[PDB]
């Protein structure tokens, strides 16, 4: 018979990890940000918003402020959020 | 055709399939659904883990059959922290409105000593230890299986399947030194606490100290 | 002839093909979060278990949702009228009748 | 033995930077001045706004700023508190007390406030 | 392509929190503490990328304005709005505030006047 | 004739949990830095977090200008403390108010002295009173008359809190006392 | 069947390795995390049944009939979990014995214990010494293979 | 990454306005002084992590505190670190502590 853990292992070791840090930062960066855009956009015209949340460490509601502010966006002809820096 | 139910629909599957681990009556696991089912009624707590609810509706049938499970085995077959299965007990408790019932010892008794593969007289004894004990609140503090565990180690300590508290421990899932402290309760009256029904392996004197 | 021996296998090997890809499911979810492993987390005996009550039970022979027609009646209760009936139904021989 | 570790550091770090002295093009006798500079130096209210109506509970700031304090600086491992019972766990340190100079690798410490 | 963008934005920027007046790309680079490009850079982003800008403005050795050449005239586009027989190419109200102030109180008023507005 | 049979053994109040706002918008990390006994990590949480050696409690400065004081053991403590924190805040440069001062929670406790049988307790009030040893050790009861939440451990000690008035914890201490000793051990 | 053919399923293809996915730009850590699971002998208990308490007893086939329960055996595992964790922390191994199930047994099978008592074992047990079975029992009911 | 404060050091000091002298002289160019200076910092890091053994035991109550950036700035008073032979009480010390 198997030992009862009183909370789960793996979610407990996820704890430690969790405690760690938080994806709750903040918003200093009404620069930082676009710095980093250009860098990302300098390798391709345009890229998905998941992977734009992923160099970010802000809410998306957040960063759809920001992709609204200096670009627009497609479905590329495949349905996903895909972003852009403004042409113009 | 039935989005809503979906969750409902698959914890139920989850609910047979937390069942399923451990050998549960149908019987029970039948209340179960119906428990949930009236809970899922209720949509009040629909702001909750449905697989919590399933587990917290499994804790409670076992009581609701007069055999509850401890949430460490509960947790054993869940994945929800043992305070949030107490979290949504509590609210499911509230939510059905429903009272429930105080552990007994004796119910713990059987398996674990089956765990050990113990004969009924050292169950027995153990179970008369462990009642008398009680009767007497020789312990009003160490949670009753941590007590009843003592006791089984005083039983068993008192035939010759005796067991390491380490090892009893590890079945019981209780700390050593929590068995330590409860057997230091429980040996000061180590020897009038055995039933008048037993057969010493070894001389409540010899029982051994920590 | 066929007999309960390659028979069951043929559901064991099945089962466990299912069973193989249902904790193959929970490895999913396991590199989804990328939290810790659990192995008898991902455990769904039953499946197999209630699986073959089916098979044993109806004489039925199939994952009953999908193939299964063409192998109904494997199955059967013990005739007690005799004890040379029930030693006719031990021994008793059937084919796919064509 | 830990004056000897510092020489160990003065001689490391000098060394490891001869070849950028070479890569501007300076002499290397500029870099035993370097060392040589170096080692020289080393030796009541009843409104909501009349809040002034309760001023002076702060003390004076001009405590903290007179090198009265010898200094310290190290990365930290823990920190706790209880209430008014706190508690640190330090690493790898620097301290310059009395005008010394002073190391360590860890540091574990308790204070009250 | 974020440079330019960089350049647009602290233009808006800088424009919006009162220096109304046109200016240049060494003046931005000196404003920004950015002058450190490189010469290379700096003469790349004033002979080709504010050439490369489609409605960037020659004032004269001064660029200006790319989103809004209208001036601040804030309340009243009747005369523009009121052409039906162009329906009045009206105004957005991005636009609106990009002009000088917020829409809201301004519309309060114009909704009773000779302004309606869908969402659309 | 007496309110209750057993009365008294004074249930002393040990906590006050109160919030004021001080007006206005607040940078904290400008108070975090200026300020000399306070804590600030926006990674942690939005608000700076200050103690005073003389109040004794710890404020929590919301950016939006709200602070809530803790640690008093009085309800006017707490206020001196949250009037004396709005100063300081005040005296770092800022328009800080003592605007819509309200006291959030107290916390009191005090011991029967006697040990009770919560079996008894616990299946005789199971609709206010609430237990389980396999969860926490002490009882947990609570009161609708005047909204109290009572905590009743094995020991006879006994603590509440949920309140906005002193008083209340007396009240519903009063309530409780004579019950506890009619299920003396 | 039970002694090799289940076992040489187990035998066949049970090990199987999974690695996370690259989550790209993380960082410099190494490379996507690997998990692997190995398996050796399968066990079988004795045709047991676990009781409400939640407690096993043996399962007497004259119980089965009895209480209509399924005449059954725990079936056990060697179960080995293997990293190559694609870390530096290659080879690094942790075993299980697991429960997978409970086998239906077939009546005088070798696991049937009572194989081996005598008639007046059998009859001590109740049971028929010229009942020789070879067929299961399901929830109570006898169950034959029809060829 | 690489805390440059320990440049903000008599170590690190000492070093820049021999540097600097450097500078003056005209014996090295500024940039030569950077990658140096750069350099020392990779070096004291090193050091640290490498040379740097010894642990010691500290008590002092706290008299102010402060925290950015995930750096802790304070300034205990009536501090005693604590050594088996250069045994240190000291009236006040600052307390810089980086993450």
Known sequence: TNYKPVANHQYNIEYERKKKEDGKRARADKQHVLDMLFSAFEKHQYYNLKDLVDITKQPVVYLKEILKEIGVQNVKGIHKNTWELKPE | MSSSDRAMMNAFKEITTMADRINLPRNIVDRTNNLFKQVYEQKSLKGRANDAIASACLYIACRQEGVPRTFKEICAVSRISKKEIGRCFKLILKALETSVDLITTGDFMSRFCSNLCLPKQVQMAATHIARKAVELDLVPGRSPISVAAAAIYMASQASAEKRTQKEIGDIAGVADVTIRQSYRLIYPRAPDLFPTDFKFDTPVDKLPQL | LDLAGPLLAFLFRGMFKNLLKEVRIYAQKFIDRGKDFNLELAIKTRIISDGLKYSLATGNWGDQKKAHQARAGVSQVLNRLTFASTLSHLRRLNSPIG | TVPKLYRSVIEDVINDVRDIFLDDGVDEQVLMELKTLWENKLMGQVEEEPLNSEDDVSDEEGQELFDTENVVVCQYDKIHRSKNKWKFHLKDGIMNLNGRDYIFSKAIGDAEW | ?120 | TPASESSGIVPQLQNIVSTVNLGCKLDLKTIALRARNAEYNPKRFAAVIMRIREPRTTALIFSSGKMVCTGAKSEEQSRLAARKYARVVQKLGFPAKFLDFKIQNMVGSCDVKFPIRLEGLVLTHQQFSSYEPELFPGLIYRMIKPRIVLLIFVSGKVVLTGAKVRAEIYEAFENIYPILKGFRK | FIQMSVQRIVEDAPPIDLQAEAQHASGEVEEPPRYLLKFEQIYLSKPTHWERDGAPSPMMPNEARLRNLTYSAPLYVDITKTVIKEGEEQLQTQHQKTFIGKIPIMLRSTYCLLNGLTDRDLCELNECPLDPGGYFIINGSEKVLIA | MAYQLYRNTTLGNSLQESLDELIQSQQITPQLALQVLLQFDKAINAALAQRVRNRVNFRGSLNTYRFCDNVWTFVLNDVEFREVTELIKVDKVKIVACD
């Open chain 5, 1 to 120: 392509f974020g440079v330019l963008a960089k350049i647009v934005n602290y233009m808006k920027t800088r424009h919006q929190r009162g220096d109304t007046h046109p200016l240049t790309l060494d003046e931005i680079l000196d404003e920004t503490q950015h002058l450190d490009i490189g010469l290379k850079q700096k003469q790349w982003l004033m002979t080709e990328a504010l050439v490369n800008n489609p409605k960037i403005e020659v004032i004269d050795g001064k660029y200006a304005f790319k989103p809004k050449y209208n001036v601040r005239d804030k309340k009243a586009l009747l005369r523009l709005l009121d052409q039906h027989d162009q329906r009045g190419l009206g105004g957005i109200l991005l636009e609106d505030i990009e002009e000088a102030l917020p829409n809201s109180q301004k519309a309060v008023k114009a909704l009773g006047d000779q302004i309606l507005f869908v969402n659309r």
